[PDB]
Amino acid sequence: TTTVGVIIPDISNIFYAELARGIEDIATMYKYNIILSNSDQNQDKELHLLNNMLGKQVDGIIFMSGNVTEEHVEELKKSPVPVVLAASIESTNQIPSVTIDYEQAAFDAVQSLIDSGHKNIAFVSGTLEEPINHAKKVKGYKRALTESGLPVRDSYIVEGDYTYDSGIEAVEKLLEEDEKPTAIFVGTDEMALGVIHGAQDRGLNVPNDLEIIGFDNTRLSTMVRPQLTSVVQPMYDIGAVAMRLLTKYMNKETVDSSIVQLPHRIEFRQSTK
Amino acid sequence: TTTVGVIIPDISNIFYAELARGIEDIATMYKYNIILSNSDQNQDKELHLLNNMLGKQVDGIIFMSGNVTEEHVEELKKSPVPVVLAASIESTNQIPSVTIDYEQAAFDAVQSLIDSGHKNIAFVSGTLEEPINHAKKVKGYKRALTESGLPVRDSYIVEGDYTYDSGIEAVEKLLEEDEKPTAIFVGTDEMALGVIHGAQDRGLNVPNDLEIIGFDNTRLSTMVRPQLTSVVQPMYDIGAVAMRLLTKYMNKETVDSSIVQLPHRIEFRQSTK
Protein backbone atom coordinates (compact mmCIF):
# COMPACT_ATOMS: atom_id res chain seq x y z
CA THR A 1 0.00 0.00 0.00
CA THR A 2 1.00 3.65 -0.55
CA THR A 3 0.47 6.69 1.70
CA VAL A 4 1.60 10.18 0.87
CA GLY A 5 2.01 13.05 3.27
CA VAL A 6 0.63 16.49 2.59
CA ILE A 7 1.79 19.53 4.57
CA ILE A 8 0.31 23.01 4.26
CA PRO A 9 1.25 26.28 5.97
CA ASP A 10 -2.09 27.68 7.18
CA ILE A 11 -4.98 25.22 7.72
CA SER A 12 -7.16 28.35 7.69
CA ASN A 13 -5.97 29.82 4.41
CA ILE A 14 -8.71 29.12 1.87
CA PHE A 15 -6.19 28.61 -0.97
CA TYR A 16 -4.02 25.97 0.71
CA ALA A 17 -7.15 24.27 2.01
CA GLU A 18 -8.97 23.97 -1.33
CA LEU A 19 -5.68 22.82 -2.76
CA ALA A 20 -5.02 20.24 -0.05
CA ARG A 21 -8.57 19.06 -0.41
CA GLY A 22 -8.26 18.65 -4.16
CA ILE A 23 -5.14 16.56 -3.61
CA GLU A 24 -7.03 14.29 -1.22
CA ASP A 25 -9.73 13.81 -3.87
CA ILE A 26 -7.05 12.78 -6.36
CA ALA A 27 -5.37 10.53 -3.81
CA THR A 28 -8.74 8.89 -3.35
CA MET A 29 -8.65 7.90 -6.98
CA TYR A 30 -5.05 6.80 -6.83
CA LYS A 31 -6.19 4.80 -3.78
CA TYR A 32 -3.29 6.44 -1.94
CA ASN A 33 -3.89 7.39 1.68
CA ILE A 34 -3.18 10.87 2.99
CA ILE A 35 -1.67 12.09 6.24
CA LEU A 36 -2.44 15.79 6.45
CA SER A 37 -0.62 17.90 9.06
CA ASN A 38 -0.68 21.70 9.39
CA SER A 39 2.45 23.93 9.47
CA ASP A 40 0.99 27.04 11.08
CA GLN A 41 3.26 29.06 8.80
CA ASN A 42 6.18 29.00 11.29
CA GLN A 43 9.49 27.70 9.88
CA ASP A 44 9.93 25.56 13.03
CA LYS A 45 6.88 23.31 12.54
CA GLU A 46 7.73 22.78 8.85
CA LEU A 47 11.16 21.06 9.11
CA HIS A 48 9.84 19.43 12.26
CA LEU A 49 7.00 17.98 10.15
CA LEU A 50 9.36 17.05 7.35
CA ASN A 51 10.78 14.89 10.15
CA ASN A 52 7.44 13.88 11.62
CA MET A 53 6.36 12.47 8.22
CA LEU A 54 9.31 10.09 7.84
CA GLY A 55 8.41 8.98 11.37
CA LYS A 56 5.09 7.88 9.84
CA GLN A 57 6.61 5.76 7.04
CA VAL A 58 5.36 7.87 4.09
CA ASP A 59 6.42 7.03 0.54
CA GLY A 60 6.29 10.58 -0.84
CA ILE A 61 5.36 14.14 0.11
CA ILE A 62 3.61 17.19 -1.39
CA PHE A 63 5.20 20.35 0.01
CA MET A 64 3.69 23.84 0.20
CA SER A 65 5.29 26.96 1.76
CA GLY A 66 5.29 30.71 1.53
CA ASN A 67 9.06 30.80 1.97
CA VAL A 68 11.28 27.92 0.79
CA THR A 69 14.69 28.86 2.24
CA GLU A 70 18.07 27.56 1.07
CA GLU A 71 18.18 25.85 4.50
CA HIS A 72 14.89 24.30 3.36
CA VAL A 73 16.09 23.30 -0.09
CA GLU A 74 19.13 21.54 1.38
CA GLU A 75 17.30 19.48 4.03
CA LEU A 76 14.74 18.84 1.25
CA LYS A 77 17.52 17.73 -1.08
CA LYS A 78 18.12 14.51 0.85
CA SER A 79 14.90 12.70 1.67
CA PRO A 80 14.31 8.88 1.91
CA VAL A 81 11.08 9.49 -0.07
CA PRO A 82 10.50 11.76 -3.05
CA VAL A 83 9.08 15.22 -2.63
CA VAL A 84 7.50 17.84 -4.83
CA LEU A 85 6.35 21.42 -4.22
CA ALA A 86 2.83 22.49 -5.02
CA ALA A 87 2.57 26.19 -5.79
CA SER A 88 5.69 27.17 -3.95
CA ILE A 89 8.88 28.95 -4.98
CA GLU A 90 12.45 27.75 -5.55
CA SER A 91 13.71 30.12 -8.27
CA THR A 92 16.85 27.95 -8.37
CA ASN A 93 14.69 25.14 -9.80
CA GLN A 94 16.53 22.47 -7.86
CA ILE A 95 13.70 20.53 -6.20
CA PRO A 96 10.44 19.31 -7.91
CA SER A 97 7.86 21.99 -8.51
CA VAL A 98 4.45 22.53 -10.04
CA THR A 99 3.29 26.18 -9.87
CA ILE A 100 2.32 29.06 -12.15
CA ASP A 101 4.43 32.01 -13.23
CA TYR A 102 3.63 34.38 -10.48
CA GLU A 103 5.93 36.89 -12.16
CA GLN A 104 3.99 37.35 -15.42
CA ALA A 105 0.69 36.72 -13.64
CA ALA A 106 1.38 39.72 -11.40
CA PHE A 107 2.52 41.66 -14.53
CA ASP A 108 -0.64 41.05 -16.54
CA ALA A 109 -2.81 42.07 -13.59
CA VAL A 110 -1.12 45.43 -13.30
CA GLN A 111 -0.73 45.55 -17.09
CA SER A 112 -4.50 45.57 -17.45
CA LEU A 113 -5.02 48.54 -15.13
CA ILE A 114 -2.42 50.45 -17.14
CA ASP A 115 -4.35 49.76 -20.34
CA SER A 116 -7.54 50.83 -18.60
CA GLY A 117 -5.88 54.22 -18.10
CA HIS A 118 -4.39 53.95 -14.63
CA LYS A 119 -1.22 55.96 -14.17
CA ASN A 120 -0.58 55.37 -10.49
CA ILE A 121 -1.45 51.84 -9.34
CA ALA A 122 -0.88 50.64 -5.78
CA PHE A 123 0.17 47.18 -4.62
CA VAL A 124 -0.86 45.33 -1.44
CA SER A 125 1.42 42.33 -0.93
CA GLY A 126 1.92 39.82 1.85
CA THR A 127 4.99 39.34 4.06
CA LEU A 128 7.78 40.77 1.82
CA GLU A 129 9.88 37.91 3.29
CA GLU A 130 8.20 35.21 1.22
CA PRO A 131 9.78 35.02 -2.29
CA ILE A 132 6.33 34.56 -3.86
CA ASN A 133 6.07 38.26 -3.05
CA HIS A 134 9.35 40.16 -2.90
CA ALA A 135 10.78 37.92 -5.63
CA LYS A 136 8.00 37.30 -8.13
CA LYS A 137 4.87 39.40 -7.64
CA VAL A 138 6.49 42.72 -6.72
CA LYS A 139 8.88 42.37 -9.63
CA GLY A 140 5.72 41.84 -11.69
CA TYR A 141 4.11 44.93 -10.18
CA LYS A 142 7.17 47.10 -10.83
CA ARG A 143 8.00 45.66 -14.26
CA ALA A 144 4.50 46.71 -15.36
CA LEU A 145 4.97 50.38 -14.41
CA THR A 146 8.65 50.73 -15.31
CA GLU A 147 7.98 49.08 -18.65
CA SER A 148 5.14 51.54 -19.41
CA GLY A 149 7.18 54.55 -18.35
CA LEU A 150 5.03 55.13 -15.21
CA PRO A 151 7.07 55.68 -11.97
CA VAL A 152 7.40 53.27 -9.01
CA ARG A 153 6.73 55.36 -5.90
CA ASP A 154 7.64 52.97 -3.10
CA SER A 155 4.94 54.64 -1.02
CA TYR A 156 2.53 52.55 -3.12
CA ILE A 157 3.64 49.14 -1.87
CA VAL A 158 2.28 48.29 1.57
CA GLU A 159 2.59 45.01 3.45
CA GLY A 160 -0.39 43.15 4.84
CA ASP A 161 -0.49 39.90 6.78
CA TYR A 162 -2.84 37.84 4.60
CA THR A 163 -5.70 38.89 6.84
CA TYR A 164 -8.95 40.51 5.83
CA ASP A 165 -8.30 43.06 8.60
CA SER A 166 -4.79 43.80 7.35
CA GLY A 167 -6.60 44.35 4.04
CA ILE A 168 -8.80 47.09 5.52
CA GLU A 169 -5.66 48.75 6.97
CA ALA A 170 -3.75 48.70 3.74
CA VAL A 171 -6.59 50.76 2.15
CA GLU A 172 -6.70 53.43 4.88
CA LYS A 173 -2.95 53.95 4.45
CA LEU A 174 -2.89 54.10 0.67
CA LEU A 175 -5.88 56.45 0.88
CA GLU A 176 -3.64 58.90 2.73
CA GLU A 177 -0.79 59.53 0.29
CA ASP A 178 -1.39 62.98 -1.32
CA GLU A 179 -1.66 61.15 -4.61
CA LYS A 180 -4.55 58.75 -3.95
CA PRO A 181 -4.22 55.56 -6.06
CA THR A 182 -6.86 54.81 -8.68
CA ALA A 183 -6.16 51.10 -8.81
CA ILE A 184 -4.74 48.55 -6.38
CA PHE A 185 -3.39 45.08 -7.12
CA VAL A 186 -3.77 42.84 -4.05
CA GLY A 187 -1.84 39.60 -3.79
CA THR A 188 -4.58 37.75 -2.03
CA ASP A 189 -8.33 37.33 -2.32
CA GLU A 190 -8.84 37.58 1.44
CA MET A 191 -6.95 40.84 1.77
CA ALA A 192 -8.57 42.09 -1.40
CA LEU A 193 -11.94 41.85 0.23
CA GLY A 194 -10.60 43.92 3.10
CA VAL A 195 -9.25 46.36 0.58
CA ILE A 196 -12.71 46.56 -1.03
CA HIS A 197 -14.71 47.00 2.16
CA GLY A 198 -12.12 49.35 3.56
CA ALA A 199 -12.53 51.52 0.50
CA GLN A 200 -16.34 51.25 0.62
CA ASP A 201 -16.48 52.14 4.31
CA ARG A 202 -14.74 55.37 3.32
CA GLY A 203 -17.50 56.10 0.85
CA LEU A 204 -15.54 55.09 -2.24
CA ASN A 205 -17.01 53.09 -5.10
CA VAL A 206 -15.47 50.01 -6.59
CA PRO A 207 -14.65 50.39 -9.39
CA ASN A 208 -15.79 53.79 -10.55
CA ASP A 209 -13.21 55.25 -8.16
CA LEU A 210 -10.87 52.54 -6.89
CA GLU A 211 -10.43 49.46 -9.17
CA ILE A 212 -9.08 46.27 -7.55
CA ILE A 213 -7.60 42.88 -8.49
CA GLY A 214 -7.04 39.92 -6.17
CA PHE A 215 -5.07 36.65 -6.50
CA ASP A 216 -6.02 32.94 -6.37
CA ASN A 217 -9.59 33.12 -7.78
CA THR A 218 -10.79 31.85 -4.40
CA ARG A 219 -14.39 31.00 -3.43
CA LEU A 220 -14.44 34.44 -1.77
CA SER A 221 -14.03 36.24 -5.12
CA THR A 222 -17.67 35.78 -5.96
CA MET A 223 -18.83 36.23 -2.34
CA VAL A 224 -18.07 39.94 -2.24
CA ARG A 225 -20.01 42.80 -3.75
CA PRO A 226 -18.59 43.95 -6.26
CA GLN A 227 -17.36 40.50 -7.36
CA LEU A 228 -13.58 40.36 -7.33
CA THR A 229 -11.68 40.12 -10.63
CA SER A 230 -8.80 37.82 -9.67
CA VAL A 231 -5.90 35.88 -11.13
CA VAL A 232 -6.96 32.28 -11.63
CA GLN A 233 -4.61 29.48 -10.54
CA PRO A 234 -5.37 26.02 -12.05
CA MET A 235 -6.55 24.35 -8.82
CA TYR A 236 -7.23 20.80 -9.89
CA ASP A 237 -4.29 20.96 -12.34
CA ILE A 238 -1.69 22.11 -9.84
CA GLY A 239 -2.66 19.19 -7.59
CA ALA A 240 -3.06 16.54 -10.27
CA VAL A 241 0.03 17.36 -12.32
CA ALA A 242 1.88 17.26 -8.94
CA MET A 243 0.52 13.91 -7.79
CA ARG A 244 1.23 12.13 -11.07
CA LEU A 245 4.68 13.75 -10.92
CA LEU A 246 5.17 12.32 -7.41
CA THR A 247 3.96 8.99 -8.68
CA LYS A 248 6.77 8.94 -11.16
CA TYR A 249 9.54 9.51 -8.58
CA MET A 250 7.73 6.94 -6.47
CA ASN A 251 7.82 4.35 -9.20
CA LYS A 252 11.22 5.61 -10.37
CA GLU A 253 9.81 6.22 -13.87
CA THR A 254 11.78 9.50 -14.12
CA VAL A 255 10.78 12.27 -16.56
CA ASP A 256 12.51 15.16 -18.39
CA SER A 257 10.55 17.99 -16.70
CA SER A 258 10.92 18.51 -12.93
CA ILE A 259 9.91 22.16 -12.89
CA VAL A 260 6.33 22.37 -14.16
CA GLN A 261 4.73 25.70 -14.94
CA LEU A 262 0.98 25.72 -15.51
CA PRO A 263 -0.66 28.58 -17.39
CA HIS A 264 -2.70 31.29 -15.65
CA ARG A 265 -5.46 33.77 -16.57
CA ILE A 266 -7.48 36.55 -15.03
CA GLU A 267 -11.17 36.31 -14.22
CA PHE A 268 -12.57 39.77 -14.75
CA ARG A 269 -15.62 40.47 -12.63
CA GLN A 270 -17.00 43.72 -11.23
CA SER A 271 -14.05 45.06 -9.19
CA THR A 272 -12.75 46.60 -12.40
CA LYS A 273 -14.48 48.41 -15.30
CA THR B 1 4.08 8.07 21.39
CA THR B 2 0.33 7.91 20.76
CA THR B 3 -1.43 9.81 17.97
CA VAL B 4 -5.06 10.79 17.41
CA GLY B 5 -7.13 11.26 14.30
CA VAL B 6 -9.83 13.71 13.27
CA ILE B 7 -12.35 13.18 10.46
CA ILE B 8 -13.83 16.39 9.06
CA PRO B 9 -16.26 16.67 6.10
CA ASP B 10 -14.47 19.48 4.29
CA ILE B 11 -11.11 21.01 5.23
CA SER B 12 -12.05 23.71 2.70
CA ASN B 13 -14.92 24.86 4.93
CA ILE B 14 -13.56 27.66 7.18
CA PHE B 15 -16.11 26.39 9.68
CA TYR B 16 -14.68 22.91 10.34
CA ALA B 17 -11.33 24.61 9.97
CA GLU B 18 -11.65 27.02 12.94
CA LEU B 19 -12.29 23.92 15.02
CA ALA B 20 -9.55 21.54 13.94
CA ARG B 21 -7.31 24.42 15.05
CA GLY B 22 -8.62 24.01 18.60
CA ILE B 23 -8.04 20.25 18.71
CA GLU B 24 -4.48 20.71 17.45
CA ASP B 25 -3.51 23.28 20.12
CA ILE B 26 -4.75 20.89 22.80
CA ALA B 27 -2.78 18.16 21.10
CA THR B 28 0.46 20.14 21.30
CA MET B 29 -0.19 20.16 25.05
CA TYR B 30 -1.14 16.51 25.43
CA LYS B 31 1.72 15.39 23.10
CA TYR B 32 -0.17 13.41 20.42
CA ASN B 33 0.28 13.83 16.67
CA ILE B 34 -2.67 15.13 14.68
CA ILE B 35 -3.87 13.22 11.56
CA LEU B 36 -6.73 14.52 9.42
CA SER B 37 -8.82 13.47 6.40
CA ASN B 38 -11.63 14.83 4.21
CA SER B 39 -15.07 13.24 4.16
CA ASP B 40 -16.88 15.25 1.42
CA GLN B 41 -19.96 14.75 3.60
CA ASN B 42 -20.19 11.31 1.92
CA GLN B 43 -21.10 8.00 3.65
CA ASP B 44 -18.71 5.97 1.45
CA LYS B 45 -15.67 7.89 2.68
CA GLU B 46 -16.77 8.03 6.35
CA LEU B 47 -17.04 4.44 7.65
CA HIS B 48 -14.22 3.80 5.19
CA LEU B 49 -11.88 6.37 6.76
CA LEU B 50 -13.26 5.12 10.07
CA ASN B 51 -11.19 2.04 9.34
CA ASN B 52 -8.25 3.64 7.53
CA MET B 53 -7.43 4.99 11.00
CA LEU B 54 -7.38 1.45 12.29
CA GLY B 55 -4.43 1.08 9.91
CA LYS B 56 -2.49 4.29 10.51
CA GLN B 57 -2.19 3.24 14.16
CA VAL B 58 -4.32 5.77 15.97
CA ASP B 59 -5.58 5.61 19.53
CA GLY B 60 -8.65 7.82 19.40
CA ILE B 61 -10.88 9.52 16.90
CA ILE B 62 -12.69 12.84 16.75
CA PHE B 63 -15.52 12.67 14.21
CA MET B 64 -17.69 15.39 12.58
CA SER B 65 -20.54 14.68 10.18
CA GLY B 66 -23.63 16.54 9.00
CA ASN B 67 -25.39 13.21 9.05
CA VAL B 68 -24.31 10.56 11.53
CA THR B 69 -26.64 7.84 10.26
CA GLU B 70 -27.86 5.18 12.69
CA GLU B 71 -25.55 2.86 10.76
CA HIS B 72 -22.53 5.12 11.19
CA VAL B 73 -22.88 4.73 14.94
CA GLU B 74 -23.46 1.00 14.43
CA GLU B 75 -20.27 0.57 12.41
CA LEU B 76 -18.73 2.79 15.06
CA LYS B 77 -20.08 0.60 17.88
CA LYS B 78 -17.42 -1.94 16.75
CA SER B 79 -14.58 0.58 16.91
CA PRO B 80 -11.28 -0.79 18.20
CA VAL B 81 -10.61 2.74 19.42
CA PRO B 82 -12.52 5.45 21.35
CA VAL B 83 -14.74 7.81 19.29
CA VAL B 84 -16.31 11.17 20.28
CA LEU B 85 -18.31 13.36 17.93
CA ALA B 86 -17.74 17.12 17.56
CA ALA B 87 -20.31 19.74 16.60
CA SER B 88 -22.43 16.94 15.09
CA ILE B 89 -25.36 15.15 16.70
CA GLU B 90 -26.92 11.72 16.29
CA SER B 91 -30.15 11.47 18.29
CA THR B 92 -29.13 8.04 19.71
CA ASN B 93 -27.20 9.69 22.54
CA GLN B 94 -25.09 6.60 23.10
CA ILE B 95 -21.79 7.44 21.43
CA PRO B 96 -19.68 10.25 23.06
CA SER B 97 -20.18 13.79 21.76
CA VAL B 98 -19.65 17.49 22.44
CA THR B 99 -21.88 20.13 20.89
CA ILE B 100 -24.14 23.06 21.68
CA ASP B 101 -27.92 23.10 22.08
CA TYR B 102 -28.73 23.68 18.36
CA GLU B 103 -32.42 23.78 19.14
CA GLN B 104 -32.24 26.49 21.80
CA ALA B 105 -29.67 28.23 19.61
CA ALA B 106 -32.11 28.42 16.73
CA PHE B 107 -34.82 29.53 19.17
CA ASP B 108 -32.88 32.47 20.63
CA ALA B 109 -32.10 33.83 17.14
CA VAL B 110 -35.67 33.93 15.92
CA GLN B 111 -36.71 35.16 19.37
CA SER B 112 -34.35 38.10 19.07
CA LEU B 113 -36.16 39.02 15.83
CA ILE B 114 -39.65 38.61 17.31
CA ASP B 115 -38.47 40.85 20.15
CA SER B 116 -37.54 43.52 17.55
CA GLY B 117 -41.16 43.38 16.40
CA HIS B 118 -40.84 40.97 13.52
CA LYS B 119 -43.84 38.78 12.64
CA ASN B 120 -43.07 37.34 9.17
CA ILE B 121 -39.83 35.48 9.76
CA ALA B 122 -38.22 33.00 7.40
CA PHE B 123 -35.74 30.18 7.78
CA VAL B 124 -33.15 29.20 5.17
CA SER B 125 -31.99 25.74 6.14
CA GLY B 126 -29.35 23.38 5.11
CA THR B 127 -30.36 19.99 3.76
CA LEU B 128 -33.40 19.08 5.82
CA GLU B 129 -32.33 15.47 5.54
CA GLU B 130 -29.61 16.04 8.15
CA PRO B 131 -30.74 15.72 11.78
CA ILE B 132 -28.87 18.97 12.57
CA ASN B 133 -31.67 20.70 10.58
CA HIS B 134 -34.95 18.78 10.73
CA ALA B 135 -34.50 17.62 14.34
CA LYS B 136 -32.98 20.75 15.77
CA LYS B 137 -32.75 24.01 13.88
CA VAL B 138 -36.21 23.98 12.30
CA LYS B 139 -37.68 22.69 15.55
CA GLY B 140 -36.24 25.69 17.45
CA TYR B 141 -37.24 27.97 14.55
CA LYS B 142 -40.88 26.87 14.93
CA ARG B 143 -40.87 26.80 18.73
CA ALA B 144 -40.08 30.50 19.00
CA LEU B 145 -42.90 31.12 16.47
CA THR B 146 -45.59 28.84 18.04
CA GLU B 147 -44.62 30.15 21.51
CA SER B 148 -45.38 33.72 20.52
CA GLY B 149 -48.61 33.13 18.64
CA LEU B 150 -46.99 33.62 15.23
CA PRO B 151 -48.03 31.19 12.48
CA VAL B 152 -45.70 28.63 10.95
CA ARG B 153 -45.78 28.65 7.17
CA ASP B 154 -44.28 25.88 4.98
CA SER B 155 -43.43 28.39 2.25
CA TYR B 156 -41.07 30.20 4.74
CA ILE B 157 -38.80 27.11 5.28
CA VAL B 158 -36.53 26.93 2.26
CA GLU B 159 -33.90 24.31 1.75
CA GLY B 160 -30.38 25.00 0.51
CA ASP B 161 -27.15 23.07 0.22
CA TYR B 162 -24.70 25.06 2.40
CA THR B 163 -23.51 27.01 -0.61
CA TYR B 164 -23.41 30.79 -0.96
CA ASP B 165 -25.36 30.66 -4.24
CA SER B 166 -28.06 28.49 -2.63
CA GLY B 167 -28.61 31.43 -0.29
CA ILE B 168 -28.84 33.81 -3.22
CA GLU B 169 -31.45 31.34 -4.60
CA ALA B 170 -33.28 31.23 -1.26
CA VAL B 171 -33.82 35.02 -0.98
CA GLU B 172 -35.24 35.09 -4.50
CA LYS B 173 -37.85 32.45 -3.73
CA LEU B 174 -38.79 34.04 -0.41
CA LEU B 175 -39.12 37.54 -1.95
CA GLU B 176 -41.51 36.07 -4.50
CA GLU B 177 -43.98 35.19 -1.79
CA ASP B 178 -47.16 37.30 -1.46
CA GLU B 179 -46.56 37.54 2.27
CA LYS B 180 -43.06 39.05 2.09
CA PRO B 181 -40.87 38.38 5.17
CA THR B 182 -39.06 41.15 7.08
CA ALA B 183 -36.43 38.90 8.73
CA ILE B 184 -34.73 35.64 7.76
CA PHE B 185 -32.83 33.32 9.99
CA VAL B 186 -30.19 31.33 8.03
CA GLY B 187 -28.62 28.03 9.15
CA THR B 188 -25.17 28.92 8.00
CA ASP B 189 -23.06 31.99 7.42
CA GLU B 190 -21.95 31.09 3.95
CA MET B 191 -25.60 30.78 3.02
CA ALA B 192 -26.41 33.95 4.98
CA LEU B 193 -23.94 36.01 2.97
CA GLY B 194 -25.84 34.82 -0.06
CA VAL B 195 -29.20 35.82 1.41
CA ILE B 196 -27.71 39.28 2.21
CA HIS B 197 -26.09 39.80 -1.18
CA GLY B 198 -29.06 38.38 -2.98
CA ALA B 199 -31.21 40.93 -1.22
CA GLN B 200 -28.96 43.86 -2.09
CA ASP B 201 -28.85 42.77 -5.79
CA ARG B 202 -32.61 43.34 -5.80
CA GLY B 203 -32.54 46.80 -4.27
CA LEU B 204 -33.40 45.76 -0.71
CA ASN B 205 -31.51 47.19 2.20
CA VAL B 206 -29.91 45.37 5.18
CA PRO B 207 -31.23 45.76 7.95
CA ASN B 208 -33.89 48.38 7.04
CA ASP B 209 -35.81 46.24 4.53
CA LEU B 210 -34.65 42.85 5.72
CA GLU B 211 -32.83 41.70 8.88
CA ILE B 212 -30.96 38.41 8.82
CA ILE B 213 -29.16 36.36 11.43
CA GLY B 214 -26.54 33.77 10.48
CA PHE B 215 -25.26 30.84 12.48
CA ASP B 216 -21.76 29.68 13.59
CA ASN B 217 -20.11 33.06 13.77
CA THR B 218 -17.36 32.16 11.38
CA ARG B 219 -14.95 34.78 10.08
CA LEU B 220 -17.37 35.27 7.17
CA SER B 221 -19.54 37.20 9.57
CA THR B 222 -17.17 40.08 9.57
CA MET B 223 -16.35 39.93 5.90
CA VAL B 224 -19.66 41.29 4.70
CA ARG B 225 -21.40 44.62 4.56
CA PRO B 226 -23.30 44.92 6.71
CA GLN B 227 -21.32 42.56 8.91
CA LEU B 228 -23.37 39.57 9.92
CA THR B 229 -25.25 39.05 13.17
CA SER B 230 -24.58 35.28 13.82
CA VAL B 231 -25.38 32.65 16.45
CA VAL B 232 -22.03 31.85 18.04
CA GLN B 233 -20.72 28.32 18.37
CA PRO B 234 -17.72 27.93 20.66
CA MET B 235 -15.75 26.27 17.82
CA TYR B 236 -12.45 26.41 19.65
CA ASP B 237 -13.74 25.20 23.05
CA ILE B 238 -15.68 22.41 21.34
CA GLY B 239 -12.40 20.99 20.19
CA ALA B 240 -10.62 21.26 23.54
CA VAL B 241 -13.47 19.69 25.46
CA ALA B 242 -13.65 16.95 22.80
CA MET B 243 -9.92 16.33 23.11
CA ARG B 244 -9.86 16.20 26.91
CA LEU B 245 -12.82 13.83 26.79
CA LEU B 246 -11.19 11.53 24.19
CA THR B 247 -8.22 11.54 26.50
CA LYS B 248 -10.17 10.21 29.47
CA TYR B 249 -11.38 7.40 27.16
CA MET B 250 -7.94 6.30 25.95
CA ASN B 251 -6.36 6.54 29.42
CA LYS B 252 -9.12 4.17 30.65
CA GLU B 253 -10.61 6.66 33.13
CA THR B 254 -14.32 6.53 33.90
CA VAL B 255 -16.31 9.34 32.30
CA ASP B 256 -19.11 10.92 34.35
CA SER B 257 -20.70 12.55 31.28
CA SER B 258 -20.66 10.87 27.88
CA ILE B 259 -22.62 13.74 26.29
CA VAL B 260 -21.65 17.43 26.62
CA GLN B 261 -23.29 20.73 25.61
CA LEU B 262 -21.41 23.95 25.93
CA PRO B 263 -23.10 27.32 25.94
CA HIS B 264 -24.05 29.29 22.81
CA ARG B 265 -24.46 32.96 22.24
CA ILE B 266 -25.41 35.58 19.72
CA GLU B 267 -22.92 38.15 18.37
CA PHE B 268 -25.05 40.97 17.02
CA ARG B 269 -23.68 43.09 14.27
CA GLN B 270 -25.33 45.30 11.65
CA SER B 271 -27.32 42.82 9.55
CA THR B 272 -29.73 43.26 12.41
CA LYS B 273 -30.98 46.48 14.04
From Swiss-Prot, chains A, B:
It comes from the Bacteria. Global transcriptional regulator of carbon catabolite repression (CCR) and carbon catabolite activation (CCA), which ensures optimal energy usage under diverse conditions. Keywords: Activator, DNA-binding, Repressor, Transcription, Transcription regulation. The gene is ccpA. The lineage of its organism: Bacteria, Bacillati, Bacillota, Bacilli, Bacillales. This is Catabolite control protein A. GO terms for molecular function: DNA-binding transcription factor activity; transcription cis-regulatory region binding.
